[PDB]
Amino acid sequence: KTRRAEVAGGGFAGLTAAIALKQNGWDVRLHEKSSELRAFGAGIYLWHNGLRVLEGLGALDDVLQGSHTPPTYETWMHNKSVSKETFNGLPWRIMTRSHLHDALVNRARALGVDISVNSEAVAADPVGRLTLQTGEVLEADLIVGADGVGSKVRDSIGFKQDRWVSKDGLIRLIVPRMKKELGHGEWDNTIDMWNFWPRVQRILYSPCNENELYLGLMAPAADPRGSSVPIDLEVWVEMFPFLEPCLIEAAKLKTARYDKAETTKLDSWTRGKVALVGDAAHAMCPALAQGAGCAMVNAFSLSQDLEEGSSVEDALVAWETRIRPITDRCQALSGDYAANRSLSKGNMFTPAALEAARYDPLRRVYSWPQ
């Protein structure tokens, strides 16, 4: 009768998988290691592909209300605008991480997904067992490893992988828009503000709504001023003086952290009844803003393959075969862009860069052609 899924991880990948499975009539239980349900990273972009997953999950309206689509995606090199991109209408959106995480949480609770906090997966067995840190062993028809880049569900089984960490990172914060204090300009835009001279510092400027601005402040990890948290106000204001009012607000934040991106690429995403989804399987460089989009699409697509009449084992193989190449291509191009600083040139959201974004998981076609 009722098939049972056990989901490890309460981030975007696990919440998506749980809602999608619960909508399809699975009895789903989700285990989050932290003692509360929360998302870190300040703010996030979604594109059409992820917005369509939110549509599929019945969470799109709660996300659109209180989030923002800029008039254009603008790039600056040394304070000179080099490009303005609108992607031929392809939907996209900027929001805080808690905004998106709360909508997914509220939808999971509305459907009756069983959520356990302080509940950490430490091992999984392909025969359909999940072991928690308490020792408790759970049996199920499907085990979803949505437990992030340091996945114990993945590493307890052993998956061949390439896993590494970027040299440099950034500080991500949410501050008031301060729109009046910013004065004349195009302050509803996304503005990716690059500089190599006098020093390597960059700010990704990302309005989330009329009240909240997501800033990503990026400097080399070896720069002891640019990499400091709480931020070293003077070194940011010096290169970004037109954002002083916002930077003053950022400088007050105690909760800011300098984070380096970590990636993982595996040969396989499945082992018997175990599927790995999201960062657990395919964490990637930040450049195309698609790590959570691909997580959500992959989690949603897993639920679709499980509706085919097949064994869970054969549905997982079919899932990875069908959907993985979109993520593999997206991760490769993002890695290339990050390492080569390619977004600094502007006009880099090409049709190939935009592939993952254009994919509609609901109809399983590419839309929004370029």
Ligand SMILES: Cc1cc2nc3c(=O)[nH]c(=O)nc-3n(C[C@H](O)[C@H](O)[C@H](O)COP(=O)(O)OP(=O)(O)OC[C@H]3O[C@@H](n4cnc5c(N)ncnc54)[C@H](O)[C@@H]3O)c2cc1C
């Ligand atoms: C600098 C940067 C900027 C980014 N910007 C974007 C962007 O704009 N748009 C985009 O789509 N993506 C972006 N990403 C990618 C995005 O942050 C991740 O790809 C996405 O959060 C992955 O979601 P997830 O559910 O797989 O993993 P996570 O978000 O890591 O969630 C995993 C959850 O599992 C919990 N957990 C961990 N281990 C266990 C365990 N063993 N048992 C149970 N629970 C566990 C964790 O507490 C967490 O709650 C960005 C990433 C970086 C580094």
